[PDB]
Amino acid sequence: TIPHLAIDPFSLDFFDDPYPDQQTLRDAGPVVYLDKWNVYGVARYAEVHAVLNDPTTFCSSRGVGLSDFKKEKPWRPPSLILEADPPAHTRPRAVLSKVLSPATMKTIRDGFAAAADAKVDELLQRGCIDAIADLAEAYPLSVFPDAMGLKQEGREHLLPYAGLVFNAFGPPNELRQTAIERSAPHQAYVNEQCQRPNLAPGGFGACIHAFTDTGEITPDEAPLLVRSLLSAGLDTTVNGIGAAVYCLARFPGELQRLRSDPTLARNAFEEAVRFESPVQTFFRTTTREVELGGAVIGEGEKVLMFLGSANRDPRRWSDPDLYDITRKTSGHVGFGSGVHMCVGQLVARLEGEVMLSALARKVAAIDIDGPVKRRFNNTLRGLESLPVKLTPA
Ligand code: HEM
Numbered sequence: 003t004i005p006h007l008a009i010d011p012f013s014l015d016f017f018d019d020p021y022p023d024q025q026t027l028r029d030a031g032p033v034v035y036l037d038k039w040n041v042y043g044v045a046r047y048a049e050v051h052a053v054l055n056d057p058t059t060f061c062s063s064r065g066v067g068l069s070d071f072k073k074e075k076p077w078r079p080p081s082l083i084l085e086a087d088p089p090a091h092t093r094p095r096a097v098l099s100k101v102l103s104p105a106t107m108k109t110i111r112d113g114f115a116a117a118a119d120a121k122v123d124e125l126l127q128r129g130c131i132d133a134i135a136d137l138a139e140a141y142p143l144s145v146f147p148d149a150m151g152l153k154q155e156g157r158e159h160l161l162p163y164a165g166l167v168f169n170a171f172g173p174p175n176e177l178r179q180t181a182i183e184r185s186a187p188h189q190a191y192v193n194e195q196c197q198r199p200n201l202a203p204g205g206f207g208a209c210i211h212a213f214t215d216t217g218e219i220t221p222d223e224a225p226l227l228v229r230s231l232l233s234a235g236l237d238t239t240v241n242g243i244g245a246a247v248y249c250l251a252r253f254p255g256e257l258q259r260l261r262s263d264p265t266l267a268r269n270a271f272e273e274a275v276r277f278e279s280p281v282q283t284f285f286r287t288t289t290r291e292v293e294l295g296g297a298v299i300g301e302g303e304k305v306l307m308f309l310g311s312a313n314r315d316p317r318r319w320s321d322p323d324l325y326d327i328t329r330k331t332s333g334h335v336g337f338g339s340g341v342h343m344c345v346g347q348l349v350a351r352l353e354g355e356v357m358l359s360a361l362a363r364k365v366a367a368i369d370i371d372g373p374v375k376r377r378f379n380n381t382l383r384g385l386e387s388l389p390v391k392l393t394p395a
């Protein structure tokens with residue numbers, strides 16, 4: 003009753019061009035079985051959204067990667083928010099929610115916007131730059147580590163650690179084994195920076211520790227919550243901003259609409275999140291026998307959600323393969339959905355908005371003028387190099 007497919011969603015060929023395989027995954031049925039990894043898969047919007055909003059059946063406490071925490075030991079201590087279910091998830095979620103709250107955005111916006119405007123002006127003086135190294139990575143590195151309150155020493159470990167984190171959600175393929183092997187130096191740095199003495203007062207890290215006074219988290223939980231932000235707060239925005247620039251480079255008509263109305267910056271970034279879905283997939287584990295799309299899934303089964311496929315499902319989106327900065331993007335699952343929806347989504351959107359604002363006001367054209375190279379990761383979709391020429395407005 004359930005179609006069995008041999009597609010490896012974590013193969014380089016899949017990363018290189020996943021859209022044909024994603025349609026095959028959607029059209030095969032509402033629920034598929036991937037024989038390559040012995041997991042169930044859902045690629046349509048309806049089922050993906052349903053699974054995300056059914057946390058008591060499709061839990062996260064057994065890991066959101068392929069590995070089942072009930073069967074294998076996690077490569078690192080489990081995340082207190084991402085890899086937990088209610089009610090354990092609730093209070094740590096509230097702390098991060100308050101640390102990264104709307105009120106908090108008010109304190110960082112001006113600095114974040116200034117850094118974006120300055121970076122775009124700097125890149126315009128160069129002309130031909132790498133939109134990844136010089137923009138997608140440079141800007142987040144210039145604002146987020148400081149917003150966390152991190153020291154200068156050791157920041158070179160931040161992106162390597164993130165790449166490891168997101169590769170480790172995948173199956174035990176070469177990408178994951180290479181990332182976990184000899185990762186101790188990255189882990190030692192991050193875990194050290196998670197301790198209260200190493201976080202500058204006023205930053206996200208210190209603010210997390212400050213919440214230990216309230217009873218919402220204990221002092222020994224605060225380092226693991228800081229670890230969450232250090233795991234998810236940087237690499238995500240790199241591929242998010244990189245996706246937006248990549249879209250603007252490929253759709254000149256949409257860059258021109260953005261130029262004509264810079265207030266579309268925020269929704270231009272949101273559409274890029276839908277269009278590219280920098281976070282491609284996550285797993286859930288069934289806590290009981292459950293019927294999904296006419297298929298009966300047993301207990302303790304892994305279920306792979308194709309967030310990117312769901313964001314391009316023609317059953318839900320008109321012209322899903324078109325970048326449209328005025329699209330009504332509400333309902334896309336690029337940030338998740340339900341109790342686990344991205345708690346850092348205001349930080350991501352703030353970075354994306356202010357960078358696209360800067361481009362909208364300062365740049366007239368973005369032309370790809372060099373070899374484009376894709377960056378392969380079991381969970382993240384993004385580019386390794388994006389040579390572009392920036393024409394000043
Ligand atoms: C474009 C940028 C980003 C994207 C596309 C993204 C995507 C996501 C997604 C899809 C989830 C759901 C995970 C799941 O359902 O298992 C999630 C959760 C989470 N994200 Fe984001 N994220 C981004 C940026 C950030 C930032 C900037 C931060 C922190 C500063 C962050 C921190 C977190 C945390 C802590 C969670 C766990 C939430 C929970 O389990 O309740 N992310 N993110």
Ligand SMILES: CC(=O)Cc1ccc(C(=O)O)cc1
Nearest residue numbers: 081084229230233234238281
């Ligand atoms: C896209 C994204 O943020 C996924 C993610 C979320 C939380 C954590 C964590 O360490 O708690 C790690 C990864």
Ligand SMILES: [Cl-]
Nearest residue numbers: 078189192193
């Ligand atoms: Cl770690």
